[PDB]
Design a binder for this molecule. Structure first.
Ligand SMILES: CCCCCCCC/C=C\CCCCCCCC(=O)O
Lengths: 347, 348
């Protein structure tokens, strides 16, 4: 779309003027064969949420998104590049066709764009702080950790330390990986017609953030993109996203505005899914959201959100108000924090 | 440049060319003072659903709608016109402000348009086949019954038997009233800028369907749902798609199967509009029933279901035997529906 491109480009110019965004630099492969590289990565929770791709082959989104990086789980990846052989993708000790299929797609991009004739061995470890739950942004943790390990092995440590370049690589695994690779509070710039190296994540800041807590819940995510995109309301959502992104940039990413927006956006996201016949709502989720909504008026600056799942993230600018809310409502979840250490190393 | 008025006028011309729609005829008052008139009226269930008004004072909707008339409740109205005296509006034995206000908005239109200097006595009786359920189109039953009684008393039996004219009067009580007054399967033509006597209900038809309701309790009042849906950021996209969907159903000659399937899709879209504004229609029991219904639909041939601005569900089928087999297999605890067979309009 031409009007969407115009608004995307306006957003890009505003970000270039702020100095927080730059088109990513590109690198030439200099493969360190037979050496194991290790990297970690963290999941994300959406504030300005994302659903639907403009170009699903390159993972270009229809509009920009904003998330924060959490510690609800952690991913660690081991990568080894071989001159010959077959790719091996191990996920939590399992060698299943499902994981292979998702990996070989980002590796296809890598081999075609950079003319690489090599085999890849990946060992992915995700440690969750919950037994089972959806919508806690696990795919962003895998995408950022795999991108960091591949960047170190294929391009070198200099490239692996370049957050823009690593977000570019992470995007090819999962769109949300752009924001996990970039930092703790980050934005992914994306819109129709954007150049490949311009559609990346970048950090907004590492100060004046907030407190958060998750209520992990079971739900009956790649289908969420198709379901939302096919909604008759999808184009109206995409259009409003450009105006909302412009407004948050003009408001200098004010914390409380983003927290409030994330609550409104949770409802809009659910509405898009509902309008396509996908009911995200489960009985237990309904009981918790009614409890949460009913009590919000009695708290100051307490907000909550959900993504494509029933897990809820409760957020507040005050740690005491958050803990008071969690205790009074007897919520049984996990305390969150922004990760402090990104590891990228040759083993 | 009003795009909704353009698509509205295109729809109107298509309907004129089919010969199923005509601008309503108007009538001069010839009041039969001191005589009691009695009429009945029935609720509706939306197929091409309606929410939000373009002009709330004249009850002009933003787009056209299609519904069917049911027997989930019934309304009976008694009307008497007096030369002098005061208006009296009794609703289920109650004389409350909320009812006087709703009746006065319509009577003000009647007195101003037709230059009537008279008092009106209305006695409205609504008998429901459920307790506390929402979204079963009760306001259409009151609107059609009151319009039939007023048309007989104020304009005469000839005007009361003119379904177009009666739907025009019913619109001033409740928009959905146009469809209830028009017949069992009907469309209300409405869009921004439409002429007053053109915004009426008309009967589509012969080859209908069977239905069954599961009345359920809900939080959101139908009157508030108009404001809630209208305030959604998705409302304009819904309105726009409604014009294209109405053009498509007219070109498909109101095919039953297509309208039943549309009503299922439209139920999701309606819920989405309410959800996007932060209004959750869902309840735990509704969730359990809709999951049971959705899970079994693939095993039935012509079975569909819908809901309006409530948790009440209406199950529909082109076959009575398939519907009863569906209701029995899922052990549904609701009420059997039927299209009303007798419309009463009488003096005394
Ligand atoms: C031109 C026709 C004029 C006649 C107008 C009179 C009709 C309006 C009266 C009452 C509206 C009733 C709406 C339904 C009430 C439900 C309220 C409840 O049950 O609590």
């Amino acid at each position: 779309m031409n009007d969407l491109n115009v608004y995307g480009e306006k957003i890009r110019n505003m970000l270039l003027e702020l100095g927080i965004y730059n088109k990513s630099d590109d690198y030439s492969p200099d493969i360190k064969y037979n050496k194991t590289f290790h990297a970690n990565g963290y999941p994300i929770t959406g504030l300005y949420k994302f659903l639907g791709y403009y170009d699903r082959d390159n993972n270009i989104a229809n509009f920009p998104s904003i998330s924060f990086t959490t510690n609800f789980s952690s991913c660690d990846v081991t990568c080894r590049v071989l001159r010959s052989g077959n790719d091996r993708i191990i996920f939590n000790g399992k060698n299943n066709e499902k994981y292979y299929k998702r990996a070989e797609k980002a590796l296809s991009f890598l081999r075609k764009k950079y003319r690489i004739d090599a085999a890849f061995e990946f060992n992915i470890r995700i440690n969750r702080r919950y037994r089972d739950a959806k919508g806690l942004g696990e795919s962003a943790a895998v995408a950022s950790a795999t991108a960091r390990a591949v960047a170190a092995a294929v391009f070198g440590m200099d490239a692996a330390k370049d957050r823009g370049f690593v977000s570019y690589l992470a995007r090819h695994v999962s769109g949300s990986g752009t924001r996990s690779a970039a930092g703790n509070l980050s934005m992914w710039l994306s819109y129709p017609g954007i150049d490949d190296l311009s559609s990346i994540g970048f950090e907004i800041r590492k100060d004046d953030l907030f407190h958060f807590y998750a209520i992990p819940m079971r739900s009956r995510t790649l289908n969420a993109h198709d379901y939302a995109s096919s909604s008759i309301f999808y184009n109206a959502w995409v259009k409003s996203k450009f105006f909302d992104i412009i407004d948050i940039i003009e408001n200098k990413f004010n914390t409380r505005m983003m927290l409030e927006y994330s609550m409104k956006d949770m409802y809009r996201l659910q509405a898009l899914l509902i309008s396509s016949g996908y009911i995200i709502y489960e009985k237990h989720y309904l009981d918790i959201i009614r409890k949460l909504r009913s009590s919000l008026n009695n708290y100051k600056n307490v907000y909550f959100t959900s993504d494509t799942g029933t897990s809820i993230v409760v957020m507040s600018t005050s740690m005491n108000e958050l803990s008071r809310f969690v205790n009074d409502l007897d919520l049984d979840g996990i305390s969150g924090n922004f990760p402090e250490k990104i590891i990228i190393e040759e083993l």
